[PDB]
Each structure stands twice: as C-alpha cells, then as structure tokens.
Amino acid sequence: ADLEDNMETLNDNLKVIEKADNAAQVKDALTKMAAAACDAWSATSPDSPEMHDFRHGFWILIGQIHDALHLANEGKVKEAQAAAEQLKCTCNACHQKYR
Amino acid sequence: ADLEDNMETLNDNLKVIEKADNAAQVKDALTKMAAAACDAWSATPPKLEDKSPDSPEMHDFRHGFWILIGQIHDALHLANEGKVKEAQAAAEQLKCTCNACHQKYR
Amino acid sequence: ADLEDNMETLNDNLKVIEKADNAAQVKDALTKMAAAACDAWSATPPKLEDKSPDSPEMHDFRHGFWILIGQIHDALHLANEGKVKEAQAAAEQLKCTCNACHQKYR
Amino acid sequence: ADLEDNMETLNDNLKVIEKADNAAQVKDALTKMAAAACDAWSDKSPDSPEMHDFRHGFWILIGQIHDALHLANEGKVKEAQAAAEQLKCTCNACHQKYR
Amino acid sequence: ADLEDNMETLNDNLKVIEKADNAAQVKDALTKMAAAACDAWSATPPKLEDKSPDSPEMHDFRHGFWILIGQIHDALHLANEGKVKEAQAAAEQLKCTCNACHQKYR
Amino acid sequence: ADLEDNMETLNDNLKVIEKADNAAQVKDALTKMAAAACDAWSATPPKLEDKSPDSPEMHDFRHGFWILIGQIHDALHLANEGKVKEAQAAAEQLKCTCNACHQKYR
Amino acid sequence: ADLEDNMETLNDNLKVIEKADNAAQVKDALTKMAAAACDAWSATSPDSPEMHDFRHGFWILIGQIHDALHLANEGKVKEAQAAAEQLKCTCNACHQKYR
Amino acid sequence: ADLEDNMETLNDNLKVIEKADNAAQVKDALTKMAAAACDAWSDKSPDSPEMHDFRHGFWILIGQIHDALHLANEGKVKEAQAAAEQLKCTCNACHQKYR
Numbered sequence A, G: 001a002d003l004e005d006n007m008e009t010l011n012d013n014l015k016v017i018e019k020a021d022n023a024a025q026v027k028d029a030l031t032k033m034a035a036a037a038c039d040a041w042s043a044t045s046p047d048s049p050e051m052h053d054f055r056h057g058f059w060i061l062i063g064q065i066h067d068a069l070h071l072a073n074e075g076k077v078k079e080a081q082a083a084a085e086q087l088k089c090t091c092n093a094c095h096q097k098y099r
Numbered sequence B, C, E, F: 001a002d003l004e005d006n007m008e009t010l011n012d013n014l015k016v017i018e019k020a021d022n023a024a025q026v027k028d029a030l031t032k033m034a035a036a037a038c039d040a041w042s043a044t045p046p047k048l049e050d051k052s053p054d055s056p057e058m059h060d061f062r063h064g065f066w067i068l069i070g071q072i073h074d075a076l077h078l079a080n081e082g083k084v085k086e087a088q089a090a091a092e093q094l095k096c097t098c099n100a101c102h103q104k105y106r
Numbered sequence D, H: 001a002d003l004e005d006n007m008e009t010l011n012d013n014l015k016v017i018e019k020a021d022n023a024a025q026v027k028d029a030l031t032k033m034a035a036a037a038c039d040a041w042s043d044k045s046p047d048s049p050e051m052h053d054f055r056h057g058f059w060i061l062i063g064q065i066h067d068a069l070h071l072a073n074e075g076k077v078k079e080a081q082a083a084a085e086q087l088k089c090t091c092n093a094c095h096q097k098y099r
C-alpha cells in the first residue's frame, strides 16, 4: 500500500482499540496495524540515511505492536490497550522528525 | 500477492543472494524477501483452512513469519554495514525456518 | 566433557534463559552454552562413527555447530546491550538448529 | 541529591509546565527538570548492562529536556509545552521496566 | 557543590585519565567529571553575578557545559567499548571546551 | 592547494552544514572539510616558515589538524546514521579547534 | 584449557600449516586452531570492557580460521596457507594491546 | 592527486621505512605515507556500502600510520619500524577485497 493507507490503517485501528470491548476486537485491530507497519517497513539513489532512519522507526513500531498483540493473546486486555496508547510515543516521534 | 507467489519471491531472492557479487544486489533481494514475508504473515495456508484463525496452529504459523522477518531484518542490517559475506550467511540460515514451517504446515 | 554432557548443558542453560529475570543470568547461561557448543564442534556422534572424519556428513555435522555458535555469539551481543527480551528470543530460535541437526544425526 | 527527590522535582515541574502561561515559567521549570535529570544520570553490579541501560535512559531524557528548553528559549512556548508532555514516554518506558 | 570544587573535580580527573592504565579507571574518572559538569550547569560564576539569569552570557555559559557533558558522554562510550586510547584522547579534546569557557567567563 | 583556500573550504562548508536541511548535504560538506583538512596537514603556515619542520610548534600545528580530522570523522558518522541535528552540532564544536589553532599560529 | 595451551596450540599449528605438504595436514592443524580459539573465546566483576574487547579478538580469529578451513576443504591448499599467514595480523594485534 | 599515485607513495615509502637507519627517514617516510592515505580517504554508487567500507579501510590505515609516527617521534625507531610492517595487513585486507 501507499503510505497514506498505512497511516489510515494505523490511525483507524488505534481508535478501534481505544473503543474496543473484548479481546477479539483488540487482536484484530493490532493485526491490521502490524501488517500496515510491515508493509510501510518495505518499499521502493542507493538509499539515504533518512530512509534508513525512517525504516527503523517502523521496525520499532512493529516490535511494539507485536508485544501488544502478545498481551492480547495472553488475555490481558487492559494491558494491551495501554500499550496501544504507548505506541503514540513512536508515532509522534516520527511525525515530529519527518513531517 | 498470493501465498504461493510470496514463496516464489522468497525462493528466487534466496538464490539471488547466493550468487550475488555486490552488496546492492543483496539488499535489493533481501528487501523483496521482507516484503514477501510481510505479505505472507497474514496468509492462511491450505492445511489450516479448517482451523480457527485464533487456533494455536494459526498462532504458530504466524509466529514462523514473525521469526523469518526478524532474520531478514538482521541480515539486512549486515548488508548495510557492507558485511556481504555475513549477510549471505544469515540468509542461508533462513532455510532452517523455511523448513521448520514447511515440515508442519506445507 | 562428553557430547551427551554438552547437550545437557545446552538444554539446561536454554531453560535458564527462558526463566531468567535479569541480564547477568542470561549472559552466564549463554556463555555456558557457547563453551558447550565449542566442545561439541569436535565431537563425533554415534550415527556417524562408521563415516570418514572428512565425510560430507561429518562436514555437515560440524557446520551445524558452527551455525549454533554464531547464533549464541549474536544472542550474547544482545544481552550485553542490555536487550534481555531480544536475547531470550534469539535464544529460543536456536531450537530450530538444535532440531535440524537432531533430525539428521541424533 | 536523593533519587526520590529527583523524580519528585521531575514530576512536579512537569505539572508546572502543563499549568504555565508565559515562557519564563516553562524555561524555569524545565531548567529544574534538567538539573534533577543530570543528577539522576549517575543489589545489581556497578558495571551491569541494567545500569548501562538505566543511565542511557536519563541520557535520552536530558536530550529531550534540552530540546524543549531550546524551543522555550526561542519563544515557541506552545511547542515547548508539547515537547514536555511527550517526555512522559521516556518516564514510563523506564518505569515499565525498572519501577 | 562549590562551582570551584566542581572545577577541582574536573581538573583532578582529567589528570587521572591521562595516566590511567585500564578502562575501569577511565570510566570512573569520566563519571566523576560528568557529575561535576552536571552540578556546574546550574551555577553562576562570579563574573556574571550582576547579570540576569536570562542574559545571553548565562545562556552561553550554560551551553558550554552542555557541550562539555556531551563530550564526556562520547568519551565514556569509547571507554565502554574498551577503546582506552581513544577515550583518553577524547578526554584531552575536552581541554578546548575548558579553555574556551575560561577565556570568556573565569 | 593554497593553505588559505583549504581554510576557505573549511569555512564555507562549516556554514553550508549550519543551514543544510537533509543529511546528504551534511555528508557532502563534511567530506569536503575532510579533504581540506587532509591537504592542510602538510602545509607550513607563514608564522612558522622560519622554524624547523621538526619544531615543537610544527608538531602542535600538525596535531591540531589530526584532532580536526577526527572530529570531522565523528561528525560524518553521526551523519550516516541520519542524526542530522547531532552531526550539525558536532560540526559546530569543530569551531573550538579552528579557534585554538588560529589563536596560536594565524 | 589454560590460555597458555590455547597459544601453544595456535602457535604449533600455525607452524605445521607453514610446513605442511598436503591438504589433510592443513585441515587438521586449522581444526586444532579453531577449537583452541573457540575455547579461548569462552572462560570464567560483571565483566570489564577489556574482557569484551579481548573476547572479540578471538571471535575475529575464529571467523578467519573458519574461512581458511573452507579454502582447504575446497582443495585450494596454497590459498589456505596464505590465510594462515594472514592470521598473524590478528595474533599480533592482540599481543600488542594486551601483552 | 591520483589514487594510483597514492598507492605508489604508500608502497615506496613503506620500503624506505624497511631500509631506514635513523628516526628522521622513518618520520619523513611515514609523514609522506600519511598524506597519500588522507588523499585516498576521499561503476558503484557514491552512497554504496562498498564505499563506506572502502573509506573506512583508509580510516584504519591512517590511525595506524599516526601511531607509528607517534613512536617515531618518541625515538622508538625500531618499534616504529615494526608498526609499519604490520600495516601490510590492512593493505592486503583491502587488496584481497577491492584490488
């Protein structure tokens, strides 16, 4: 996907998680997020260091998303949603820098 | 793309990395691999179509790609450091993970 | 020590790393693993006793430890960077290599 | 001073930045936050990677406070106010791990 | 502490490093230097007592320690890798910062 | 080249970096600064023409560029990681070395 | 083994390789070396950075030994012996520093 | 100057250090070697990791020449003479790879 979709996806599903009731909604939104992050982490100069640093921010995000999913799969719902709110830290870090 | 199609990409770009002289060929291959592994991570394989998406088998299948993706990330990182021979080695080790998933769900 | 004895050490210290809280426990375990893998690299396993030391099987057996040793080196490196959770993950992935050699020569 | 007293100064002054109106209270409050954070960056061993890690946390924190002061000093108060809120990320990140 | 004694601390340790044999010594010295630099950041030097805490000279004085701190950190890092010589030489480049500030505000 | 023009090159690029937006700019500037510094290493400045090539002042003059070079390298590295701000600020700390040498031999 | 043995081994087998006739003598001496390096790379403070840097020198050595063995296993004898002579570079690097 | 001319200066001056008697020829020859090596450190792309790698090679080489001069400057001629011989390691290492 287009990077803009990847952001729609991440942003949309962040909201879903916040509003979510049960664990199946959380797992499902985070899965969507994980994939968007993975796709955004791979795209089409031999490659600038701002590219390297950009890609790296997605890689962090993925790992964090992945931790959160793990909590949701363990059944810890409360804990998962908090991690999702903690992701914002990384979202804005990037946006500050590259936007 | 298709789960089959992803496996193709992985396998071609594995061979590209064996036969690669220079570091650009290897980044380029590994990146095409990562993209393929990312797409595959969401796929649902034949043998597990009858299973729940939440089944331990589907969990485990997803985990194999999570692993594979980390191994490509780690190999990428080497190729950036210009460590061609290392990155080709880290790539050859992927086959273990390829095989372990195949053994179980192919 | 004995090839069997090495496999013990590996397996105990694999479990230590699963249950480890702090980073010192994990370095300490991984180091005991490395030492064991190093000793094993020269060992000659039962199933291959009839083979030439220069046989492709013995080559391949040695290669599995060479691989395993690199994976412990790489996991060690993470534990030094204080990246406990990563190093425990890199450790769990060893099992693939444990298993691939076992499949063939155990 | 005491590490308890560092964390209090951090927390309190973070609140004062939330509440502040003009650049000078923000400049002042951050200046205090910085001191506490430099103090801080200084059963487990002295050499242990948990301490390399712990210290490195405050190194991040300091860089972030320095930036937020640089904004305050320029007169971008609002932008400084936000830089400050996002510090929490690092606070928590340490807390999650070592609180 | 006495701004003066922070400076005693910086100067003493500068020399310690200069004749240190091993890294553990160097880290320790640098770590004391960092502590001193941190405490120094807040101080008003006698030449600026008359001046506004906001004065451009106080900003410049503060910024001098900020540079100093950074350099100490960069030298610490060279020490943790065990590049003793490289740490020792970083630590000698600090003298430029010492001197620049001193030339303007001592 | 003209020692003077090396210094023109160092000064021009110092400013380039100062107002660069992206990293590719910064690397380029730093790389020119390195080239200039290298060529400068061999030069005799007018104030030392009278002196022995072995003279302690020529050693000290040479050593000033050696420091400078190192700092350029350390700033280059911050640039290749894409820490633009950090590179830009390293590059401002070079001014201390510029000034120290100038104060003594210009 | 004692580090002194590890050195006897490495030194003894370097000489053997130099004097070697056939590929089986080279493979065999390098194998002995590889093992000595591996053992020296693992031994019995939370751990000094000079220790880290020391261990690292062995790790380089192993990788080099391993390349050389590979050439010998391919049949390239001449090439292997040269690599063994190239190892000295690493041997002395360490000795300079730590001895 | 030309990169061919760098490598010649390096090689020739390396020979002059082998042959030298007093500190001044060693000091001089290395001084020349250093210049050539600083020149050098400066179909594949500009940004490529092969060039990061190539350059980094000469960075090593320079550090080694600097050390060997520092010995020469102290009057440890013999020790400088050996520091010089061991440079070959780096020469070859580059050569093996990029000659």
Ligand code: HEC
Pocket (backbone or CB within 6 Å): A003, A004, A005, A007, A008, A010, A011, A014, A054, A055, A057, A058, A061, A087, A088, A090, A091, A092, A094, A095, A098, A099
């Ligand atoms: C960089 C490493 C990023 C991370 C991590 C995240 N985002 Fe992002 N985001 C990034 C860029 C460069 C852009 C601008 C590109 C463009 O033109 O679209 C964005 C943009 C957004 C947007 C709005 C863009 C749009 O579609 O019009 C949103 C809503 C957004 N990003 C949300 C978002 C969330 C929720 C993230 C984490 C959970 C996140 N982003 C991470 C770069 C990066």
Ligand code: HEC
Pocket (backbone or CB within 6 Å): B003, B004, B007, B008, B010, B011, B014, B045, B046, B061, B062, B063, B064, B065, B068, B094, B095, B097, B098, B099, B101, B102, B105, B106
């Ligand atoms: C699971 C977690 C897998 C990992 C990791 C890898 N592969 Fe795979 N692969 C997997 C499945 C379930 C299948 C069957 C697909 C189907 O619908 O039939 C495959 C298939 C392949 C194939 C064959 C495709 C075909 O032509 O039928 C190849 C060539 C292949 N896989 C290669 C491959 C490589 C090289 C991998 C890692 C480097 C790899 N796979 C990982 C499941 C999984």
Ligand code: HEC
Pocket (backbone or CB within 6 Å): C003, C004, C007, C008, C010, C011, C014, C045, C046, C061, C062, C063, C064, C065, C068, C094, C095, C097, C098, C099, C101, C102, C105, C106
């Ligand atoms: C080959 C290259 C191997 C690798 C890598 C690992 N192991 Fe292994 N293991 C191997 C063999 C040939 C054998 C049989 C030994 C015998 O003489 O009987 C083993 C055996 C074990 C055992 C069982 C020992 C016993 O009680 O009989 C265990 C528990 C074991 N191995 C564990 C293990 C682990 C945890 C590894 C990696 C992390 C590992 N092995 C790697 C060959 C190889």
Ligand code: HEC
Pocket (backbone or CB within 6 Å): D003, D004, D007, D008, D010, D011, D014, D054, D055, D057, D058, D061, D087, D088, D090, D091, D092, D094, D095, D098, D099
């Ligand atoms: C580590 C790298 C930390 C960072 C960065 C921050 N904090 Fe912290 N904090 C840390 C520890 C280990 C502790 C426990 C200390 C104790 O003895 O309790 C704390 C504690 C606090 C507290 C509670 C202390 C109390 O008196 O009860 C607060 C209020 C606190 N921390 C706030 C805080 C803020 C606001 C931070 C960033 C802006 C922050 N901390 C960062 C470790 C670390």
Ligand code: HEC
Pocket (backbone or CB within 6 Å): E003, E004, E005, E007, E008, E010, E011, E014, E045, E046, E060, E061, E062, E063, E064, E065, E068, E094, E095, E097, E098, E099, E101, E102, E105, E106
């Ligand atoms: C400003 C940004 C400074 C930096 C950086 C350093 N120093 Fe300093 N130093 C500074 C001042 C204003 C003074 C005068 C203090 C006073 O109260 O009169 C000093 C003083 C010293 C002294 C003399 C100390 C004494 O006991 O009288 C020393 C020996 C000294 N400073 C050393 C020093 C070193 C070694 C530095 C860097 C490594 C350094 N200073 C930095 C202001 C600043």
Ligand code: HEC
Pocket (backbone or CB within 6 Å): F003, F004, F005, F007, F008, F010, F011, F014, F045, F046, F060, F061, F062, F063, F064, F065, F068, F094, F095, F097, F098, F099, F101, F102, F105, F106
């Ligand atoms: C000694 C070790 C030096 C260092 C480090 C730097 N410079 Fe320099 N510079 C030096 C000398 C001896 C001279 C005089 C040259 C002459 O022939 O008279 C200079 C001169 C300059 C000048 C003026 C250049 C001109 O065209 O007249 C500038 C602008 C200059 N130097 C800048 C400069 C910068 C920006 C440096 C570091 C980044 C720097 N110099 C270092 C000796 C030394």
Ligand code: HEC
Pocket (backbone or CB within 6 Å): G003, G004, G005, G007, G008, G010, G011, G014, G054, G055, G057, G058, G061, G087, G088, G090, G091, G092, G094, G095, G098, G099
């Ligand atoms: C450090 C990372 C080393 C590498 C790589 C190599 N050697 Fe070494 N060696 C090292 C040390 C610290 C010592 C002294 C320790 C002691 O007291 O023994 C040595 C010593 C030797 C010796 C003599 C020691 C003895 O047994 O009396 C020899 C002959 C020797 N080393 C040879 C050698 C060779 C051939 C190497 C590479 C092929 C090599 N060493 C690497 C540290 C390190």
Ligand code: HEC
Pocket (backbone or CB within 6 Å): H003, H004, H007, H008, H010, H011, H014, H054, H055, H057, H058, H061, H087, H088, H090, H091, H092, H094, H095, H098, H099
């Ligand atoms: C890379 C990082 C290098 C280092 C370090 C050294 N050399 Fe080099 N050298 C290098 C290259 C890519 C080439 C090929 C250049 C060409 O156009 O041929 C060379 C070449 C030489 C040559 C031959 C050039 C000729 O005119 O035929 C010599 C004699 C030479 N190099 C010597 C040399 C010495 C003595 C070095 C260290 C002390 C050294 N080189 C280091 C790349 C690199």
Ligand SMILES: [Ca+2]
Pocket (backbone or CB within 6 Å): A005, A008
């Ligand atoms: Ca859309």
Ligand SMILES: [Ca+2]
Pocket (backbone or CB within 6 Å): A019, A020, A021
């Ligand atoms: Ca609802």
Ligand SMILES: [Ca+2]
Pocket (backbone or CB within 6 Å): B001, B002, B003, B039
């Ligand atoms: Ca698809």
Ligand SMILES: [Ca+2]
Pocket (backbone or CB within 6 Å): B004
């Ligand atoms: Ca098929």
Ligand SMILES: [Ca+2]
Pocket (backbone or CB within 6 Å): C001, C002, C003, C039
């Ligand atoms: Ca044994």
Ligand SMILES: [Ca+2]
Pocket (backbone or CB within 6 Å): C004
């Ligand atoms: Ca048994």
Ligand SMILES: [Ca+2]
Pocket (backbone or CB within 6 Å): D001, D002, D039, D040, D042
């Ligand atoms: Ca304190």
Ligand SMILES: [Ca+2]
Pocket (backbone or CB within 6 Å): E002, E004, E005
């Ligand atoms: Ca006093």
